[PDB]
Amino acid sequence: MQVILLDKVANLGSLGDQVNVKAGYARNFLVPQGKAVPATKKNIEFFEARRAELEAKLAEVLAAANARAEKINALETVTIASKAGDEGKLFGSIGTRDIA
């Protein structure tokens, strides 16, 4: 019985390693004690959907995380009016409440 392991079984595999297990081992232990589920070539894509979909929603964010750091060195100059007077003391007005 070809099963996909939902967890680490000691002498078999690791969170997905399709192995050929005796049917009694799977029928009576690995499936009811949820260490595995049979390899129907739908569960090789349905709970290896955790291998497929949860991996497939990472390649476009890997590409979308490149167009976010593209608008970085664009503006780089702001009208800053709080002068560093006699050696730089903060008293002015630049950030986080209200300009009208």
């Binding site: 019985m1 049917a23 029928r27 499936v31 009811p32 949820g34 589920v37 049979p38 129907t40």
Partner: protein, 77 residues
Amino acid sequence: SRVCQVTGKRPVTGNNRSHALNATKRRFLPNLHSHRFWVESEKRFVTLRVSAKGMRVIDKKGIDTVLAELRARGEKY
């Protein structure tokens, strides 16, 4: 009765044939076993009287589909 709930295998009749070809009526009974099947879709064990072949049918088809066939066929499990 000695009937598999999955496949419907029943006792069937035949002959014992000796070397002299004496025919005496016999029976061929199914390899029936009461077995507790885990239903992950119900968080529950279901007990079926099932042939060893029916167990292979359950492994190949899945218990969720086999129980659907039963409740279509009546067969209060």
